[model samples]
Target chain A: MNISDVAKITGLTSKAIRFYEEKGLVTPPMRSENGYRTYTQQHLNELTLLRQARQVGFNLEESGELVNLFNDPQHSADVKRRTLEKVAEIERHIEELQSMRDQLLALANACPGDDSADCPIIENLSG
Target chain B: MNISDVAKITGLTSKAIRFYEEKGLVTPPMRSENGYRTYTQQHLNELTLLRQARQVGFNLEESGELVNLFNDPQRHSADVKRRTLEKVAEIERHIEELQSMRDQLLALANACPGCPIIENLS
Candidate 1:
């Protein structure tokens, strides 16, 4: 397949696909017969994983760790450990967002809103 | 209090506290008796909030919005109400994404096909 084809299937833009390759998160695609870009199902999967990995708060460097879980057949045990670590890390961050959300809602409700007074929104968030 | 005192309380470094002051996220702290830098309880609160806010995923630039929420006479109800409600919704959206992301990570972990290569290594 071509770059655009993988991008269409993966919901990633062409630039995002190339960036992953540049960062070595995804392996470089093969050259096209016509001297363009060509890809495979493997490339598609890697790109999809990269995008999802980022959504869960893994930076590009951390996301690169996931590829080892796929590429290395020997250290499977070690890879799984890191993967679960990522899951736990993600769970902690999700809870952090929940806490922030609660504080924001408190700030919002404290306001009287009709361009009036009594919004202790500042004090509400400070702690 | 000195900048060091608030830095100790907040987890924000002295440099970060000064950057916030430079960006106008914080008001200029008072001059010290030592003629250096000193801060107030309100400054402590702002620095603490700044650190926690970024840890919770507010981009450094976006965290600047807190200046409006905290410092502006913002005594007016409307801007605070708007910013707070908007931020509340944005956080909820990301929470769902991270939640879903975790579920998949767990699933991948359970059925993951690796680490069985001990024999191969041997």
Candidate 2:
């Protein structure tokens, strides 16, 4: 497979695929006889994992940690487990955001839209 | 009150408080006799709001929107509602993070901590 094909498999833009390689997230594809890039199934698998990690809010650096653990079979499961913990933390943050949203919505409802700046939303949120 | 006093009231560092002022999040407190900041209760209140918004994952721009809605009596309710919805979105992201963390922890437990590169924990 070539770069474009790899991008298609990974659901990443071609530019992003290249960037991942540049960031050492992906190994440089083998050069073809005519100087074209060539990839294999291994590359596709890595790309899939990378996409999954990204979806869960792993930064590039953190995602790299996942890749390292994955490739190092000796600690594969442990590495994956650690990354999952980070994801859990991310989930907590999302929940907190939802809570904050609810609070703001309630405050908004209480405030009279047509009134002067003496709105209760200000009073509550500012606290 | 001076900048330090205002900072204490809001639990914000002086630098961060100043940055907020620079971002137009806070009005510049009136200068004191010695050119120090002189803040009133209103300024302190605004600072408190700024802190809360930041705690809730509101970017500076979004926080500004909150301030605007707060100051504008005409928009009293709807503006706050919009901001609240945004906060809800932030919470969802946090929950997703926690879930990811739990999964990673499980994977770690399964990987034995010793042996060669193929030792499962690798």
| lDDT of all predictions | 0.71, 0.70
Compute each candidate's TM-score over C-alphas: 0.66, 0.66
> Where does model 1 exceed 4 Å of error?
A1-62, A75-77, A114-116, B33-35, B52-65, B72-74, B113-122
lDDT of 2 by residue, B62-120 (tens): 88777777666566454565566667666666666666555654454444353221222
lDDT for model 2, on a 0 to 1 scale? 0.70
| Backbone clashes counted, model 2 | 48
Docking quality class, candidate 1: acceptable
lDDT (0-100) at residue B80 of candidate 1?
58
Question: What TM-scores does chain A show, candidate by candidate in order?
Answer: 0.70, 0.81
How much TM-score does chain B earn in each model? Answer: 0.69, 0.84
The parts of candidate 2 lying over 4 Å away from their true place are: A34-36, A98-102, A105-117, B1-23, B29-41, B57-62, B72-122
- Candidate number of the best DockQ: 1
DockQ of 2: 0.31
